[PDB]
Amino acid sequence: KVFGRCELAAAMKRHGLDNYRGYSLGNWVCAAKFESNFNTQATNRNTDGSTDYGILQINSRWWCNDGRTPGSRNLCNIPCSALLSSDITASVNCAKKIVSDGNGMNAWVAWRNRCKGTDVQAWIRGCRL
Ligand SMILES: c1ccc(-c2ccccn2)nc1
Ligand SMILES: [Cl-]
Ligand SMILES: [Cl-]
Ligand SMILES: [Cl-]
Ligand SMILES: [Cl-]
Ligand SMILES: [Cl-]
Ligand code: NA
Ligand SMILES: [O]
Ligand SMILES: [V+3]
Numbered sequence: 001k002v003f004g005r006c007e008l009a010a011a012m013k014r015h016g017l018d019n020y021r022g023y024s025l026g027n028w029v030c031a032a033k034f035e036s037n038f039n040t041q042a043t044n045r046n047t048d049g050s051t052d053y054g055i056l057q058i059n060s061r062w063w064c065n066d067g068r069t070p071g072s073r074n075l076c077n078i079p080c081s082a083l084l085s086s087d088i089t090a091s092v093n094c095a096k097k098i099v100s101d102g103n104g105m106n107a108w109v110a111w112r113n114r115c116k117g118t119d120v121q122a123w124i125r126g127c128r129l
Helices: 005-014 025-036 080-084 089-099 109-114 120-124
Strands: 043-045 051-053
Touching: 005 025, 005 120, 025 109, 025 120, 051 080, 080 089
Parallel strands: none
Antiparallel strands: 043 051
16 A cells, blocks of 8 residues: 555554654654655565565564565564555554664654754645544
8 A cells, every 4th residue: 555645644644653762753654655655565676685675664584574674573473464554553563662662763764864953844744633
């Protein structure tokens, strides 16, 4: 599913990401825009051989099992394919674990490079939330 911006914002809000560990909702919307272009089916390889999955491009190196990332962990206890669903629940629940872990949203390279330090409230401008 390719979410609309406000559609995604509303789903993320319902799932409690607004100001989760201090990250206002626009952070999460921004991150998804640049990680996945709002596409739940997005998959991308990394140079280490891991793959990033879904709307928030959760990585098989640590967070999910895809059976093809040697030495990796599955800290969200989920098949990576579960993260490609039109329902964002599994991705959000995993994201909450990731962001709570010490490094905050820096885990998301696109967030760090494109959202951090910017007016992220612009990403929820016009949305009824
Ligand atoms: C190295 C550098 C960037 C990325 C990335 C960017 C957006 C979405 C997913 N992965 N991955 C590895
Ligand atoms: Cl993509
Ligand atoms: Cl990429
Ligand atoms: Cl596993
Ligand atoms: Cl694996
Ligand atoms: Cl933080
Ligand atoms: Na894994
Ligand atoms: O990534
Ligand atoms: V990547």
